Amino acid sequence: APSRNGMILKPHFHKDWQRRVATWFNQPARKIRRRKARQARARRIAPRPAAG
Amino acid sequence: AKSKNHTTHNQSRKWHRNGIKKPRSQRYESLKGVDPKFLRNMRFAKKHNKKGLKKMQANNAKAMAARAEAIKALVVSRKLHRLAYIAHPKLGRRARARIARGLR
Amino acid sequence: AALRPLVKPKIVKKRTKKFIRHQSDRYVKIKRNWRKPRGIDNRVRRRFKGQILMPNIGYGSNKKTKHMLPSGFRKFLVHNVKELEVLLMCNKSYCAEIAHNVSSKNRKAIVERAAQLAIRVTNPNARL
Amino acid sequence: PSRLRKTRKLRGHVSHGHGRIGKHRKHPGGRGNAGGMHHHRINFDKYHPGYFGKVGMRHYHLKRNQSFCPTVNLDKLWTLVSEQTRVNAAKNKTGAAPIIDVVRSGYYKVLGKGKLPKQPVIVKAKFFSRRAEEKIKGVGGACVLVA
Amino acid sequence: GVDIRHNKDRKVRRKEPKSQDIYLRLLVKLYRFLARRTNSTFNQVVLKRLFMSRTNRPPLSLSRMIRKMKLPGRENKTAVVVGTVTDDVRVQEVPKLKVCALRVTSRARSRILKAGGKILTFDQLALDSPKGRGTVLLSGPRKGREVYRHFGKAPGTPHSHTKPYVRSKGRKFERARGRRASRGYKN
RNA sequence: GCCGUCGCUGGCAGUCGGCAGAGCGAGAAAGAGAGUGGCGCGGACGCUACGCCGCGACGAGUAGGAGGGCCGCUGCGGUGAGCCUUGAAGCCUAGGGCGCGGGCCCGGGUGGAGCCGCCGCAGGUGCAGAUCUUGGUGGUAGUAGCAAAUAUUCAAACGAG
RNA sequence: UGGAAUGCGAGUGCCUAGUGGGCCACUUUUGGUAAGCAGAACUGGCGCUGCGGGAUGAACCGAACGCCGGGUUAAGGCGCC
Ligand SMILES: [Mg+2]
Ligand SMILES: [Mg+2]
Ligand SMILES: [Mg+2]
Ligand SMILES: [Mg+2]
Ligand SMILES: [Mg+2]
Ligand SMILES: [Mg+2]
Ligand SMILES: [Mg+2]
Ligand SMILES: [Mg+2]
Ligand SMILES: [Mg+2]
Ligand SMILES: [Mg+2]
Ligand SMILES: [Mg+2]
Ligand SMILES: [Mg+2]
Ligand SMILES: [Mg+2]
Ligand SMILES: [Mg+2]
Ligand SMILES: [Mg+2]
Ligand SMILES: [Mg+2]
Ligand SMILES: [Mg+2]
Ligand SMILES: [Mg+2]
Ligand SMILES: [Mg+2]
Ligand SMILES: [Mg+2]
Ligand SMILES: [Mg+2]
Ligand SMILES: [Mg+2]
Ligand SMILES: [Mg+2]
Ligand SMILES: [Mg+2]
Ligand SMILES: [Mg+2]
C-alpha cells in the first residue's frame, strides 16, 4: 500500500526471475581468458599487427 | 456486527496537544483574489513610479532643509537618600573618601 | 598486614539481593538471569505490591564507591608481569587479579613481582 | 551491516514492532499499485495527479537520435574555448574576433540565458534562439549557421 | 506529582560534529575554546556551523561571494564560509578577495590566487581574527537542493506547485487526470 | 542522602613558576593598561578535552519510536613479543566478589588441546510459549491388565533350576 | 509612558511507527417498561497505571510511581481481628 508521498514503482519481478540470475563471478576469469587468447593470437600471426 | 457510529470524544484533547495555533500573520498579505480591474491599475501605478523620481528628491531635500533649519533655531527620607547616594559606586566615590579620610 | 588503599570509605549498597527473573522459581527452563517481563497482564511488569522487583537506574551505586572491592581497591585482570607494571603508579587504588588461565609456573613470577611493587593481589595463594 | 539494524533491538519484544492489534499480515490493501481508483484513491490523487488517463498523440518507432539537440546558454559560451583565447582577443587592437564553434564542443543550439562580456565573437551553431542572436549582436558578434 | 509535560525537555540540536574527521574536530576544539573564553558571538556562530551536517553547509559559489563582498562598506574584509567555495564559470572577472573556508575547489583556488587574493584556513582565521573582527560571514543557499522542490502542499492540491515523484518525465507520466480540465478535473 | 535524565547550547587549554608572583563571584558596561610633560632553588591533584568539574529541575507507562551498552554468540583484518600439557575449551560447585541490569571476574574440582582481551569488519547472532521440530525423561504406576471357545491330576527322568 | 492582569523562550522543516473493535463516571440527552440495554454532547478517567482508603472489585474516593532515612498529611479511620 502507498504510504504518504512517494514514487509509483513497477518492478519487473512478477516472473521466476531467480531462475535466471546471471552472476558475474567468472568475470576476472573471462578477462584472463580473453587476454591469454590475445597474446597467443599475436604470437601466432607475428609480425603482422596484433590489432588485426 | 454493529459498532460505534461517531464521536468527538478525546478530540479536543488531541487538538490541544500541539495547541490550536492561530494562523500566521505577516505585515504584507498576498493580493490574491482582489478586484482584477483595481489590480491592473495598481500595477500601472507602480510601473510609472519612477517618473516622479526627480521631483521626490527635490521635495525631500527641500523638506529636510526646512526641517533642519527649524531645529537649528530651536536648539522617601532625606537620610535614606543621602545613604543611597554614598552607597552608589560612582556617585558616592568622593563621599566614601571623605568619611575614610576623617576616620583616619 | 595487607596493603591498604589510599582511602577506605563506607560502601553503601541500595540492594544486595540479586534480581531473579519472573517465574524462574517455577521452572528449570527459566534461568534466574534477569529478563524484562513484557506480558500484557504481567503483574510483575505493572509493579504490583509484594511481587518480584524489577531493576531500574535508581538502584545505581554511588559513583565514588562503584566497582570498589570490600578491601577498598578496584580490581584489574592481569595475564603476565608486563601487564602488572601498569598498576605501578595506581597501587593505592587498584589491585591485581591474575587470570584463571595462567599456569602455576607463571603465577609465582607475577605474585613475587607484585610484592616488590607493593601491588595487591586478590588471588595470590592459588594454584600453589 | 545487520548489527546496526532494528532487528537486533527487537529481540525479546513480542510483535517485533508491528503491533499487537493489527499485527503484521501478508498483504492488507493489495499488492503493488492495486486500489488506485479505489480504496487507495486519496493517495494517488493527492500525490500523483494526472496518473490516470491519456493525453496527446502516439508516435510509433520513436528514434531519440533525430531530436538530438544539446543546448548551451550564453553565460557559459566562453568556456568552450581556452582562457587565453578571450584575453588575447580582449586586448587585441585589430578588432579580430575569435570563432566559437559550439558543435565542436558538442552543442547544436545556443540559448540566451545570461549576459556576454563586452567583446566581439563569431559563433557557429546549427541553431540559435532569438534572444541569443540579439545578445551576440549587442557585443559586436556575428552568428554563423552550420549544418 | 508536578503537572508538566516532558515531550520537549530534550532539545534536538548538535553539540559536536557527527563527522569523525580529526581535522574538523581540531577546529572544533579550537573554536570551542574561543567561543567559551571570548564575548564574541561570531565565534559562537562559527562553532555551531562546524557541527552542522553536509546539507546544512551548502557550498558558496564564487559569483555569490563576489556579489556579497561587493556591497558598500565591505572592502578589505575577510569572507568567511563554513563550507566549500565552489567555482562559477559564469563569472568573467574575479576581484582580489580574502576568504576563509573549510574547502576551496581546485579551480576556485587558482582564480582567487591569480587575482591577488588570499585563502585562509579556519585555524589561520583565529590567529588573524581571534574575535572575528573585520569579517563577512557568508552562507550558501540552503534551499538550493532538488529535495526542496518536492516539499510543501501535496502536488494534487489547489495551487500546489510541488514537484511530484515520477520515474520518467513525458506525456505519458502523470499528466492526464487531475492536471487538466479535459480529463476529470484540475486544481 | 544516592542513581540516572534534562537544562544552564554552564566552567577548565591559566599546569601562563626564580625569563615566577598566584585575582577576575561580583548589585549596578568598559584596563589588576603603557609609558610623555607639568641565607634557601621550593611550591599536592589535574587535562583518556569522546576528558574532567559545578549548579538547578525532574523520573508512571501498553502499542510504538529513539539512544547507549567495558551486554552476550560465531567468523575475518589488525594488535596484545597475549594465554596454554607447570594444563585450552567444556562441564560441576551450601567458595570470594563486581555491576541497576544484560553479564563478568577470581577460588576449587573434573577435563585433556586448544583459547581469549582491545581497534575495526561481518552475520544463518540471544527463546518460555508457536495443539512449534527432533531427541530424552517423568507422575499416572508396580496401576489398567495378562477372563471368548468345559480340564486337569499322580509318579519318574534329564537338570543348578 | 512597547499603552490591561497573569504566566511562559519561541518559530520552522523533513522523515515517521502504532492506531483507526473501545469502554466507564458527574452533568445534559434520544429510543425503550426497563436493562450491567442501544445511541449522542462535555470533561475526566480505565484501556497504558501502580499506590493509600472503599473487606473484596478495570473505572469510586485520595493520590499518580527513580533507590532510601526522618517528619506531616489526603481520602479514610481508631472494641478485637
Ligand atoms: Mg505504514
Ligand atoms: Mg469503528
Ligand atoms: Mg491489560
Ligand atoms: Mg514496548
Ligand atoms: Mg502478534
Ligand atoms: Mg514499527
Ligand atoms: Mg492494521
Ligand atoms: Mg482491528
Ligand atoms: Mg508487509
Ligand atoms: Mg516525581
Ligand atoms: Mg513521560
Ligand atoms: Mg519527544
Ligand atoms: Mg520512564
Ligand atoms: Mg546448585
Ligand atoms: Mg587426543
Ligand atoms: Mg554463519
Ligand atoms: Mg526451548
Ligand atoms: Mg492388578
Ligand atoms: Mg485370553
Ligand atoms: Mg452506553
Ligand atoms: Mg488494546
Ligand atoms: Mg495517558
Ligand atoms: Mg490511575
Ligand atoms: Mg463495600
Ligand atoms: Mg516516610
PDB file of N, CA and C (backbone and C1' of nucleotides) in Angstrom, chain G residues 14 38 55 62:
ATOM      1  P     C G  14       8.117  20.033   5.247  1.00  0.00           P
ATOM      2  O5'   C G  14       9.490  19.330   4.886  1.00  0.00           O
ATOM      3  C5'   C G  14       9.507  18.021   4.360  1.00  0.00           C
ATOM      4  C4'   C G  14      10.721  17.260   4.811  1.00  0.00           C
ATOM      5  C3'   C G  14      10.470  15.817   5.185  1.00  0.00           C
ATOM      6  O3'   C G  14      10.410  14.975   4.053  1.00  0.00           O
ATOM      7  C1'   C G  14      11.797  16.840   6.843  1.00  0.00           C
ATOM      8  P     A G  38     -25.110  -2.029  25.254  1.00  0.00           P
ATOM      9  O5'   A G  38     -25.748  -1.247  24.035  1.00  0.00           O
ATOM     10  C5'   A G  38     -26.231  -1.946  22.905  1.00  0.00           C
ATOM     11  C4'   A G  38     -27.103  -1.069  22.051  1.00  0.00           C
ATOM     12  C3'   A G  38     -26.539   0.286  21.682  1.00  0.00           C
ATOM     13  O3'   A G  38     -25.554   0.247  20.668  1.00  0.00           O
ATOM     14  C1'   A G  38     -28.750   0.560  22.391  1.00  0.00           C
ATOM     15  P     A G  55     -15.270  -1.922  52.622  1.00  0.00           P
ATOM     16  O5'   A G  55     -13.785  -2.399  52.298  1.00  0.00           O
ATOM     17  C5'   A G  55     -12.810  -2.560  53.323  1.00  0.00           C
ATOM     18  C4'   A G  55     -12.358  -3.994  53.466  1.00  0.00           C
ATOM     19  C3'   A G  55     -11.991  -4.716  52.178  1.00  0.00           C
ATOM     20  O3'   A G  55     -10.639  -4.499  51.814  1.00  0.00           O
ATOM     21  C1'   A G  55     -13.427  -6.078  53.499  1.00  0.00           C
ATOM     22  P     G G  62     -11.459  12.886  45.340  1.00  0.00           P
ATOM     23  O5'   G G  62     -10.030  12.702  46.010  1.00  0.00           O
ATOM     24  C5'   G G  62      -9.814  13.005  47.376  1.00  0.00           C
ATOM     25  C4'   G G  62      -8.589  12.317  47.930  1.00  0.00           C
ATOM     26  C3'   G G  62      -7.279  12.535  47.198  1.00  0.00           C
ATOM     27  O3'   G G  62      -6.681  13.787  47.460  1.00  0.00           O
ATOM     28  C1'   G G  62      -7.499  10.259  47.739  1.00  0.00           C
TER      29        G G  62
END
